[model samples]
Target: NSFSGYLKLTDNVYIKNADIVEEAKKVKPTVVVNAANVYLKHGGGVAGALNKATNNAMQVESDDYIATNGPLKVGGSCVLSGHNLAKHCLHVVGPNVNKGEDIQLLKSAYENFNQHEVLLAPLLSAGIFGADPIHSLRVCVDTVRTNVYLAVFDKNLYDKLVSSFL
Candidate 1:
């Protein structure tokens, strides 16, 4: 229907399949998670797409920033200002595991959303990183049990995600 499909996972959490960038133009989410590596290398996946949406401002967060420990460490997170749609952005290092072996990365990233009212996030590692979308969706369902918004550009993403119901 509208913007592909929308799922109200919980009380306030909503998941949808559509152009996240274009979606950004409509709703100003409290926070949008930038799923990328520790280096914040956003050449593809949600990061790069988000970059274009933010008028290429995502680089400012990736550049000249000290990791404090290392790059792409699991459970590590960094915050930045949203480019156009989101009020804020959180750059979390996904597990980068194949086939969604490490759901903890999703768990950790999900833990960071409590401070805000509504959060928009990508299915970390589901795209360019090649994690299993079904498993990833399960992890998200488990972790973000409250208020949040999940955005994706492909309608297939909604299928990969909602298929978990059956």
Candidate 2:
């Protein structure tokens, strides 16, 4: 029965140490959390011009784009790709496909913490691809401590996690 731990933020607000699938079942959350990865093309990069256009389009679409390309992972076909059971998935893409590998992922996770009630993540999930496990844990726990709802990982690494938020 000891799947994860929990931290109480306030009277009704609490942070749980459950996976995304488990939290979904318990909370029936109203909003989905996410981060996005953007593969930027160097040629013809218009900087803020495209962002303005996209922002207008997003407003018309009514979908909240918290993080850029990193947020794209969970909304479309990728939602069905994961094993975690949830009404919606918050996908945080690792930052800067052309630069540091984990930047997008870490930033996306932090964005989730800023916006969502909880963050349900599977660190070892295939989406991370070739990421180092310990590094991922360090980054996620550090960024996601206060806002994270549940941070799930493979059972082998569960005991290794140490969070001051707990």
Candidate 3:
């Protein structure tokens, strides 16, 4: 099954626990986008991680931009400032993880009219706070379906998911 198939079966689109390059090739996607992480290692938390992932994806599929809420590490815990990645980066702030902030951020992304191929990552220790991988994947699927957007998860799971999109 393809990514489209997963979307139809689960009524949500997500790409979790998979290799970025292989998944991108399988989907033959045009653009790749990611959410923000909480903390930053040398200003490489959400924005930096997204940039690295996006750049890696570009190696296979070029012409994609990094979409987020704001600067690389403005409000978040990023250390390297003014180091932008991707063709374009959009930054926006939302509630904290405990308050279901990610959902709002996703909504804001959509509200801002960013209708593109979204490649979301795990919420890190912030959103789920020791959340089970499978459960986290399910939440992401639900969010994408509810928002009526195409989503894919990165291959981060230890074992291969039974689904074809994975």
lDDT per residue for candidate 1 within 81-164, as digits (tens), equals: 887867888887767766354655666866666666566777766776666777767666777655767786788667766766
Best candidate, lDDT: 1
**lDDT computed for candidate 2:** 0.39
Cα lDDT listed for each candidate: 0.70, 0.39, 0.35
TM-score of decoy 1: 0.82
Give the Cα error of residue 107 in candidate 3, in Å: 8.6
The sequence of per-residue lDDT tens digits that candidate 2 reaches over residues 1-166 is 2224555433322344344434544555543333333322112122122223333342222233323333344212122111123445444444433444554455454445445454444542123344554565555555554444444434444444434324
Off by over 4 Å in 2: 1-19, 32-88, 95-105, 124-128, 162-166
Q: Which 10 consecutive positions of candidate 1 have the poorest summed lDDT?
A: 1-10
Query: Quick one: best TM-score, which candidate?
Result: 1
| Residue 74 in model 2: lDDT | 22
